[PDB]
């Protein structure tokens, strides 16, 4: 079965997803052509343990070897930080997680590097669009399927694909619990939501066709095709008549509420 | 079916919504302990045909003998205007409706007489809340049950109960036609919302149990069991992202569209 | 404000569950040692046709012979009217379905005869009280599992067993159709229920084995194990939020309604 | 105001009184377990037409369709003969009304079926005595409501009571006239008796409670208990020195005048 939460596991998990929101506001400063990859990763590390006195949950994580996520063009997922510079052109995802006395906060967003084609900042906007829309039905009552059918329909009319072989999760004392959100679908499958369920909403959204590969490293999975993927995500709570968002930050202007 | 308006129907349906809201902002200044239900209703229908030029759609209809309906403490509904005096620590509804160049609008309010007690006070605050929270799920895509489970639940946990058989309507050229609105239900249920479509959302809540009986006159509807009732009213659009309230008054804090 | 609209075909199936629901009423009162099942048959008959103006859905119905069905002791239920007297200490079920102007409504009852064991007025108590509480979970929304589950957990946790072979229905202007309501389970399968549906409620619970069979006139079912057996009905309407029940009695405690 | 006859009026009224008694004497020996009361109905009015050169008052008056009234066990009153045999262990009323050259005369009495229970043959006997108290007290100078307190006292002193809703009438050339008759009341009440007054006497008496309820044909009223009712009736004149029953049967032990 999926865990429900008390009102004090609540009152915890309200600071996490604050101070990860707020590990994407301080790095926007740093994003410009010649910055590499592993240079970001060094700053975010030192802000999260130095100054938040909180720890990277990436870190050592089933021997993952980095701290933060970093995925450039073509690439869908999972991208490892190192020594390449940013270019004039690149669309880029950063992905973070952070633990606060025990307790998870999971969040990330898109990024355009100088002049970009038309076509690239359009799928980022589409992209957004589509994960605010699968938060406005989330309520007591609802149903799992509700959440895919929204996203898939939106995509679809636009001319772009939803990838299939990745999805969202619940969260809390673990960083993965049940249940599997998948992001395509049919209204009223699967499971009915209850008061106090926590999970996250990440729809992957791809330029040509759905298919994905895994490279060598055993980690960084891209497009089969070789066109471009673009991502973004919330942490979300189930209340009394509706939603709240646990990661909101203050440069957005979509209602923290129902 | 259900009627869909133009944009000449709708340009004339908010020159009415905003002469009923006046009517009220108006007779406010006349209420204390003394004055007489009788002629509360003289002075409204003077105003409404020789100052606005327009004409009270109650007068006459399916043989009611006045041009408003007044209704106090334990009455529910279509109460008559006549010579008894208000006293001190009444609770009073005004029901309004006015026809301008064939076209309708329709509100209501609740108003305090001389110094009240606390228990009266609560319910009149809590049914307000309601009606609000029924407004601010309106937008195309929605369903008529979401309006009926948002008031149920609000009246419900906070001690209170909902009349069952008196509803809300749709309104245009003519006073009452379809759909018929209820104020207790289920989510994502009923007919499905879409743009310029115009109806009513007016619920009725009660102190005590939720039954109601008929009077000897065969109009006025009480409580069965004499504790009190209280009722709050707009008229609504749904528009390309959301809604538009036709009768707000400027006393009010609560904002016109979404 | 205005007053609700009622659709005619619902305004029709209430008038038909009154009229059932007054039969059990009016037949309370000839039940006593002595009297025969035949004899109350042709009671029955005369009422619904002469007084009421209507027509038993039973008589002539895939073959059956009477009006009414009447099931005593170890029988479960189909029972045949016949010659036999009533004796001091039995326990007795009455069931009945009536037709007025096309449309059907269906309801039975448990009678106590003359002085009766403490083991048999435990068991009729229990079995009221499943049915029940199954009637309490019927709202938009909800599962024909949910319905199974309760009634299955109420009858075990105090001795007893559940019959599995014979189940509910919808009912309207025909007397069987979709779907099968059946009185075990578990919670979240089968269809989901929507505003408007019309079905039966009908438990058998027995005081052993749970087990059947069926004698030879192709009708009476009794217990394998040869101990007691009984049955309550009611006819329900899915509404806007909750239940309504078609074939309440004056006589019962129990609220008609959800709201309540 | 009450008519007054004539003494031409009055020998033409003994012509059909004497009649409607000879009926129920002839009909008695056709009454016994299995005859149904259609074959009642066409006995009676074969001997009214062929026989007695007169017309049966029930036949197409308002709509009823039979020549006699019918009513057995639980029905109070207006049962319509049918094909339904008599079964051992019934009671049952037959009412009779006969025009002879223009004038009306008006008459009812209980038979017993085969073998009876002892307390219904009880019922049956005190529903009679009730009738012969409220003839003994008319005469000239009495009032109407002296006729209902003696019944009422009688009646409810051996734990019955009395039908409210149907009453007894003035009679002549026409059928039903002025005054109306009740069955209960009080002494010295209502309209003074006078010389030439002509009127009936016809209580309906139950076992239990005294409301009473319509069948669907509009005509059939039965007990709303279900329990058994009882009824007699007599054609009345008030004379000189008190009265004369104009309908006495000669098995009859009751004094015809003061
Ligand atoms: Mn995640
Ligand atoms: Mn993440
Ligand atoms: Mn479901
Ligand atoms: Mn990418
Ligand atoms: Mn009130
Ligand atoms: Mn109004
Ligand atoms: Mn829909
Ligand atoms: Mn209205
Ligand atoms: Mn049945
Ligand atoms: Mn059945
Ligand atoms: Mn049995
Ligand atoms: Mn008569
Ligand atoms: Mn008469
Ligand atoms: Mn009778």
Redesign the pocket.
């Given at each position: 079965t999926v865990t429900i939460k008390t009102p004090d596991d609540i009152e915890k998990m309200r600071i996490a997803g604050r101070l990860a929101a707020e590990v994407l506001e301080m790095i926007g400063e740093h994003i410009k052509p010649g910055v590499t990859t592993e240079e970001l990763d060094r700053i975010c590390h030192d802000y999260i343990v130095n100054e938040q006195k909180a720890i990277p949950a990436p870190l050592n994580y089933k021997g993952f070897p980095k701290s933060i996520c970093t995925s450039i063009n073509h690439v869908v997922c999972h991208g490892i930080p190192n020594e390449k510079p940013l270019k004039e052109g690149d669309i880029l995802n950063v992905?973070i997680?952070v633990i606060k006395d025990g307790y998870h906060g999971?969040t990330?967003k898109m990024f355009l590097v100088g002049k970009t084609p038309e076509w690239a900042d359009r799928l980022c906007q589409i992209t957004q669009e589509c994960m605010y829309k699968g938060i406005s039905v989330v309520r007591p009552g609802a149903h799992l399927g509700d959440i895919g059918e929204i996203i898939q329909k939106h995509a679809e009319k636009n001319g772009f694909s939803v990838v299939r072989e990745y999805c969202?999760?619940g969260?809390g004392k673990v960083?993965?619990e049940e249940p599997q959100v998948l992001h395509y679908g049919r209204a009223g499958t699967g499971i009915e939501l209850k008061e106090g369920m926590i999970f996250?909403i990440?729809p992957m959204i791809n330029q040509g066709r759905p298919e994905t590969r895994l490279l060598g490293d055993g980690w960084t999975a891209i497009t089969k095709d070789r066109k471009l993927s673009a991502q973004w995500?919330h942490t979300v709570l189930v209340t009394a008549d509706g939603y709240e968002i646990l990661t909101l930050r203050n440069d957005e202007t979509f209602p923290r509420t129902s």
């Open positions: 992905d997680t999971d990330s969202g999760h969260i960083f993965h996250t990440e995500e």
